[PDB]
Design a protein around this ligand. Structure first.
Ligand code: EYP
Ligand code: ZN
Ligand code: ZN
Ligand code: ZN
Length: 101
C-alpha cells in the first residue's frame, strides 16, 4: 500500500533523451543487480543489498525519488516510503515497456 502522494513529487523530471534502459548497470560499481534509476537526474545506481550506491547518491545529491528496475516501484528517501501517483505513471510505463518488451 504505497503513499498516494508525497511532497517530493515536484522533483520528478522528464526522462532522458534516449529513454530508459532497465538493464543499465550501476554507474559506480557496474553491478547488473538491484539497480534503481533516479527520477531527478536519471543516473542509475544499485540498491542497499548490493553496494548501496543509490542511497549514496541520495546523500550526495539530495535527490528524493528512485524507480526500481526489478519491480517498477518508486521509493522516496525523505518520506521513507513507496509512492504511487499520476506524476510517476509515464516513467513507470516507459520502464515497463523496456523491461517486458
Ligand atoms: O528494512 C527496514 O529497516 C525497514 C524500513 C525499510 N527500509 C527500506 C529501504 C528501502 N530503500 C529503497 C530504495 C533502494 C535502495 O537504496 O535500496 S526501497 C526500500 C524499502 C525499505 S523498507
Ligand atoms: Zn553499485
Ligand atoms: Zn539523481
Ligand atoms: Zn517524499
Amino acid at each position: 500500500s504505497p503513499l498516494p502522494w508525497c511532497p517530493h513529487l515536484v522533483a520528478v523530471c522528464p526522462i532522458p533523451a534516449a529513454g530508459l534502459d532497465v538493464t543499465q548497470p550501476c554507474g559506480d560499481c557496474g553491478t547488473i543487480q538491484e539497480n534503481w534509476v533516479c527520477l531527478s537526474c536519471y543516473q542509475v545506481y544499485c540498491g542497499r543489498y548490493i553496494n548501496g550506491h543509490m542511497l549514496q547518491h541520495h546523500g550526495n545529491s539530495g535527490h528524493p525519488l528512485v524507480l526500481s528496475y526489478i519491480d517498477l516501484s518508486a521509493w522516496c528517501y525523505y518520506c521513507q516510503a513507496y509512492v504511487h501517483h499520476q506524476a510517476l505513471l509515464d516513467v513507470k510505463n516507459i520502464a515497463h515497456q523496456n523491461k517486458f518488451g
